[PDB]
DNA sequence: CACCGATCGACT
DNA sequence: AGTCGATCGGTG
């Protein structure tokens, strides 16, 4: 199921959805939302260490995400209990999907894969 | 210094 | 109007 999670998302990069998505914001969120149908548990962990130093990235609320950051445009996860910031560059979208990619055990070359079409 | 925040400009 | 997200000022 490692094998599964990783053809997966390979897939996803091939698929026509994905090329469906205008801006870098919006495979942001199909990333995001594909990662958790995979693993909810894992989704879950690599979220909780997943902060910044005055911003909650991740919350179960718009309201949390609201309430510890100024504006950061919190945005809801598509088949998803959660809520994640939206005003970052991507740079740091990239940051948030390598670090969620790497705690759910991706290989390297796969986040940078991904990483790389955000 | 490398990392983070969020203003405000670019594009629609 | 509204969205996106690079740029640059903060910060530890």
Redesign the pocket.
Known sequence: TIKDKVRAMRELLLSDEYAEQ???????MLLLSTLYSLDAQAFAEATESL???????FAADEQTLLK??????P?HVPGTPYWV?????????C?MIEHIMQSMQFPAELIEKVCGT?
Not at 68 to 73: F, L, P, S, V, Y
Request: hydrophobic content about 20%; aromatic content about 6%.
């Open positions: 205008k801006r870098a914001v919006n495979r942001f902060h910044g130093r005055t911003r909650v990235y510890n950051g100024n504006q950061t445009k945005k910031i939206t005003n970052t560059n991507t740079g740091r979208k940051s955000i």
